[PDB]
Amino acid sequence: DQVQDMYYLSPMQEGMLFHAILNPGQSFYLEQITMKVKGSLNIKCLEESMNVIMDRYDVFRTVFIHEKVKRPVQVVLKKRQFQIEEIDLTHLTGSEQTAKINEYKEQDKIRGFDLTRDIPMRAAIFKKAEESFEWVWSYHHIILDGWCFGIVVQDLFKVYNALREQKPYSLPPVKPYKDYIKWLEKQDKQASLRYWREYLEDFEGQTTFAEQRKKQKDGYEPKELLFSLPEAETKAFTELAKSQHTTLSTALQAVWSVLISRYQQSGDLAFGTVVSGRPAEIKGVEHMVGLFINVVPRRVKLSEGITFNDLLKQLQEQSLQSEPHQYVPLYDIQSQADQPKLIDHIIVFENYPLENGFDMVDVHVFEKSNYDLNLMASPGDEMLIKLAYNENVFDEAFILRLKSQLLTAIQQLIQNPDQPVSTINI
């Protein structure tokens, strides 16, 4: 037998597997990393390093079985070989190389992953010229989220940049994903469901930006508006977050709360937020690799006279009480309120968003969007904010207005953190 271990699926993994089988070929839970490499690259060592990553991270040797079993199980294999699929585009013009790679990217989203047999990650390198390559990296979220993929990337390049130069290396020990499954099986699932039920008690629901939503036929027109926060306000926004003993993510959620409070004309609002899902009870959970992040509902209550520091407190405290219950899938939370549309937009703060070797220019991450509006923020000397929206629902003019309103609200809130947020002008 080629089986190394066998354990159950996390609640998120089970719903992910359930929807993946029911909707094949719809790019569900698929992430496609596309990048152009301008430089020299040892293909054989990249293949060798990938197989080190293969045997270092058990999530890549994992398959899922749902048939003829009372409850789905994940099977990790003792050994599996990864082929990096090299494609020669030297004998082709530029346009044929572009279409050949674009044909791969479109077909790759449709093929997806047979989670019962395939490796939940596939790679393709297109040699378009000498020292000119294009990488199409794909993986399934059932085994890997965005943050943990960066850990795999650094481990791959550490092994790559060493093997080629013959110099040896050592890699930090990894904690098996089974330890997270073990922690889950020890939690009271009903106690976590009750937390979200109480947390969302008497919430009526809301269609965010209702009068700005265009009422057309369903369908997604992906568009983006990217902008930065100047270093001065970024340093002050971080200092205010450090002063109030809260995170930079919570600080942005509070600014967004004030903005939507004006559009909805209400003090009871909800939006999606991505939580780490990494329980601090497990030691070394920071170095584990697997599926941890989750979108959970965030309910913000804005009473009369509430200040930004008061809002910063309400949010940071709820972030702590929710930590033992961040494993609950959003479907289970929404069913415990008969509100299939409890949230319709999310805020994401990626602290490490997606030298030795070559040059990596033009990175693009493809991910199917489940919401008509997504506020994405990344750290840095000047905070980078992205507004990814569906053009069939929202116009660019409104997204541009939200940019100006978000920038002026950030400034007004860092300078008057103890003034009632109702006094903020947007």
3-class DSSP assignment, residue 138: strand
The C-alpha torsion from 40 through 43 and 44 to 50, rounded to 10°, is 120
Q: Which domains does the chain have, with CATH numbers?
A: 3-174 (3.30.559.10), 204-423 (3.30.559.30)
Q: What is the Cα–Cα distance from 384 to 398, expressed in whole angstroms?
A: 19
The contacts of residue 222 (CB under 8 Å, 6+ apart) are: 369, 388, 390, 391
The β-bridge relationship of strands 3-8 and 86-88 is: unpaired
Could you tell me which residues are beta bridge partners of residue 7?
74
Per DSSP, what are the bridge partners of residue 349? 377
Determine whether 210 is exposed, middle or buried from the number of CB atoms within 10 Å of its CB (0-12, 13-18, 19+): exposed
Residue whose C-alpha is closest to residue 127's, from 85, 86, 83 = 86
Strand order in the sheet with 373-378: 222-228, 384-390, 373-378, 345-349, 268-275, 294-301
Q: CB under 8 Å, gap of 24 or more: what pairs does 207-210 form?
A: 207/341, 207/344, 208/260, 208/263, 208/264, 208/271, 208/344, 208/345, 208/373, 209/260, 209/263, 209/373, 209/394, 209/398
Chain centroid to CA 41: 29
Look at the chain and count its residues.
Answer: 426
Distance CA(85)–CA(108), nearest Å, equals 13
HEC string for 190-228: HHHHHHHHHHCCCCCCCCCCHHHCCCCCCCCCEEEEEEE
Residue whose C-alpha is closest to residue 308's, from 407, 425, 232, 414? 414
Q: How far apart are CA 420 and CA 426, in angstroms?
A: 14
Q: Does residue 217 contact residue 369 with C-beta atoms inside 8 Å?
A: no
Cβ count near 43 (within 10 Å): 12
Both structure tokens of 295: 């979108």
d(CA 67, CA 267): 47
Residue whose tokens read 């019962």: 116
Count of beta carbons in the 10 Å neighbourhood of residue 273: 24
The C-alpha angle 405, 408, 412, rounded to 5 degrees, equals 130
Q: Cβ contacts of residue 186 below 8 Å, gap of 6+?
A: none
Contacts of 256 (CB under 8 A, 6+ apart): 271, 347, 375, 406
Helix (H, G, I), strand (E, B) or coil at 317: helix
**In what helix (H) or strand (E) does residue 68 lie, and over which residues does it extend?**
none
Dihedral of the alpha carbons of 6, 8, 10, 13, in degrees to the nearest 10:
80
CA distance 123 to 47: 10
CA distance 407 to 383: 11
Answer whether 16's CB lies under 8 Å from 295's CB.
no
Q: Which residue has the tokens 């093997």?
A: 163
The Cα 375–Cα 405 span in angstroms is: 13
Strands 373-378 and 62-65: unpaired
